[PDB]
Amino acid sequence: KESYSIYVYKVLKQVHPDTGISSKAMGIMNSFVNDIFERIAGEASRLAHYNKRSTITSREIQTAVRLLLPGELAKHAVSEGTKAVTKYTSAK
């Protein structure tokens, strides 16, 4: 487990600039991030176990997202992940 509160709060300021969050709601959001990330990371690790030298790249995360997220959430998440990787490889 890792603390993601600062990041959850930065995103809250983007979406609802003048809205706060209670301590218990932030605890639930930290559990949300950690638990979803554990499922993503676990599925990516399972897929990488099939790779000759166990390589993990964005493909294993994309395939995990498609398996784990339902319908439109998966479509949007894939679009967000692909856009972030495109930005990352194009920039320094």
């Binding site: 890792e2 993601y4 990041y7 959850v8 930065k10 995103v11 809250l12 983007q14 979406v15 609802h16 003048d18 809205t19 706060g20 969050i21 209670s22 218990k24 709601a25 639930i28 959001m29 949300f32 991030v33 638990d35 979803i36 990330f37 499922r39 993503i40 990371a41 990516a44 690790s45 990488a48 790779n51 030298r53 166990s54 390589t55 993990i56 790249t57 964005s58 294993e60 995360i61 994309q62 997202v65 784990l68 997220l69 339902p70 319908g71 439109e72 959430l73 949007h76 998440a77 967000e80 992940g81 692909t82 856009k83 972030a84 990787v85 930005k87 990352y88 490889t89 920039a91 320094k92």
Partner: protein, 86 residues
């Protein structure tokens, strides 16, 4: 930073170290993971904050998070499967 290069708020470097802690692990796997966690966080917080606003309060509480998730079949199914263990 890797997060700035990716246009993200979520911590790409820390996520990359977590993936390595569990073979070559590309930084793109950490960028893609941070992007999907940031996307899901933004969707949940926006819907919960809209429930807070409709209730004429100034903060998100666990009940607003529950109202958000219950009002979206995809978020409800994702949380149900996460709690179940997939």
């Amino acid at each position: 930073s890797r997060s700035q290069r990716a246009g993200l708020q979520f911590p790409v470097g820390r996520i990359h170290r977590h993936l390595k802690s569990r073979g070559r692990v590309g930084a793109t796997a950490a960028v893609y993971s941070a992007a999907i966690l940031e996307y899901l966080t933004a969707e949940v917080l926006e819907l919960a904050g809209n429930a807070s606003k409709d209730l004429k309060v100034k903060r998100i509480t666990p009940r607003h998070l529950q109202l958000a998730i219950r009002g979206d079949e995809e978020l409800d199914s994702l949380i149900k499967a996460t709690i179940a263990g997939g």
